Design a protein around this ligand. Structure first.
Ligand code: C86
Length: 370
């Protein structure tokens, strides 16, 4: 209900993600760690990459144990490291110390951000996508196995430049949201996979076969900035967003994220309906242009914004563009994810982000890709 010591334990800069302070080893080494519900490894800088403020020094730790195994993790950047275990704690988190797997990062490319204040990543998703395989127990799994911390965590990510928010570990803080929580099932415990059953732009249904909304999956990912949509869905959404915002024209490159525009009510709300807890029942989460038109503050050659909805080949990714609207409860114990209106979300006098239900939606199981 109330975890005041964990409130406001997240920091970041716009476009660089949200991080939490952790300690690794004995005596404790303080590191800032990106909170990532889209991956499953605890991986920290362990060598003096010039972009890093701090890094894990295994030689200074008496509780370090070598697993004598390496791991190589390419993405569409990359990183490589050495697997071990050590004692891990979260200063503005529950009062516990856990022995966790750590990938000591020894080489990387396009992974760390030049100018950011974090030097590792906390993968909070499930073992099935852990590298090199599902035998490497993710951090949160170790946390639950070794303590009486309940098997859930919740995230309030606050946008718009410093950002902040809260990671409530083992519970929910009711001051972080307004109205009620609405829950969608976690379809499979790998990513935080969910099913989208309907899409509306300013209340107008896109009218697509709902399978296309989830081709080939839909996930909830704090480690991605954009709302990413499958190519066909993105196509249809931009078309509809263009129509709704017709009073001004804009170049095609802007909608494709290939150029910024410099200059809210011009733009429509976007609603995703998610599978509910009950047969034939759904609910709707709604975001504003405040969430999906993101300011780009680092423009030396210019008040510019990037269109932060983009096309994807890996499915829908509900990134920061979605999560900044909402308090999001990752209720692992019950295989579900709760959304509520965030008490910190950016909005105006006319429109607010919303979570509403129940709605009647048939054939919701058919929306999943197999
Ligand atoms: C592990 C990986 C990854 C994420 C990031 N994330 C950011 O830099 C970032 C920036 N801003 C954000 O919000 C706005 F503030 C959020 N997150 C960086 C490196 C990285 F490796 C992999 C990423 C993937 F796309 F390569 F798969 S996605 C993914 N889920 N995890």
């Amino acid at each position: 209900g109330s975890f005041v010591e964990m409130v406001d334990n997240l920091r970041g800069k716009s476009g660089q993600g949200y991080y939490v302070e952790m300690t690794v080893g004995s005596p404790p080494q303080t590191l800032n760690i990106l909170v990532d519900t889209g991956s499953s490894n605890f991986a920290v800088g362990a060598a003096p990459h010039p972009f890093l403020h701090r890094y894990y020094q295994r030689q200074l730790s008496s509780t370090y144990r070598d697993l004598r195994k390496g791991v190589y993790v390419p993405y569409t950047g990359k990183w490589e490291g050495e697997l071990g275990t050590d004692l891990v704690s979260i200063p503005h988190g529950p009062n516990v110390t856990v022995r966790a797997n750590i990938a000591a990062i020894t080489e990387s490319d396009k992974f760390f951000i030049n100018g950011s204040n974090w030097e590792g990543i906390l993968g909070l998703a499930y073992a099935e996508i852990a590298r090199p395989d599902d035998s490497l127990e993710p951090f949160f799994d170790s946390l639950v196995k070794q303590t009486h911390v309940p098997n859930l965590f919740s995230l309030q990510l606050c946008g718009a430049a410093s950002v902040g928010g809260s990671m409530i570990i083992g519970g929910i803080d009711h001051s972080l949201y307004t109205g009620s929580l609405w829950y969608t099932p976690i379809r499979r415990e790998w990513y935080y996979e969910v099913i989208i059953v309907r899409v509306e732009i300013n209340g107008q249904d896109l009218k697509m076969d709902c399978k296309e909304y989830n081709y080939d999956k839909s996930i909830v990912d704090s480690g991605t900035t954009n709302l990413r949509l499958p190519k066909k869905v993105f196509e249809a959404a931009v078309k509809s967003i263009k129509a709704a915002s017709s009073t001004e024209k804009f170049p095609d490159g802007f909608w494709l994220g290939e150029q910024l525009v410099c200059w809210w009510n011009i733009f429509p709300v976007i609603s995703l309906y998610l599978m509910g807890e009950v047969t034939n029942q759904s609910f709707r989460i709604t975001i504003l242009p405040q969430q999906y038109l993101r300011p780009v503050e680092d423009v030396a050659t210019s008040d510019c914004y990037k269109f932060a909805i983009s096309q994807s080949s890996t499915g829908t990714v509900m990134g920061a563009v979605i999560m900044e609207g909402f308090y999001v409860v990752f209720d692992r114990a019950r295989k579900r994810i709760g959304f509520a209106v965030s008490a910190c979300h950016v909005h105006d006098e006319f429109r607010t982000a919303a979570v509403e239900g129940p709605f009647v939606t048939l054939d919701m199981e058919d929306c999943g890709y197999n």
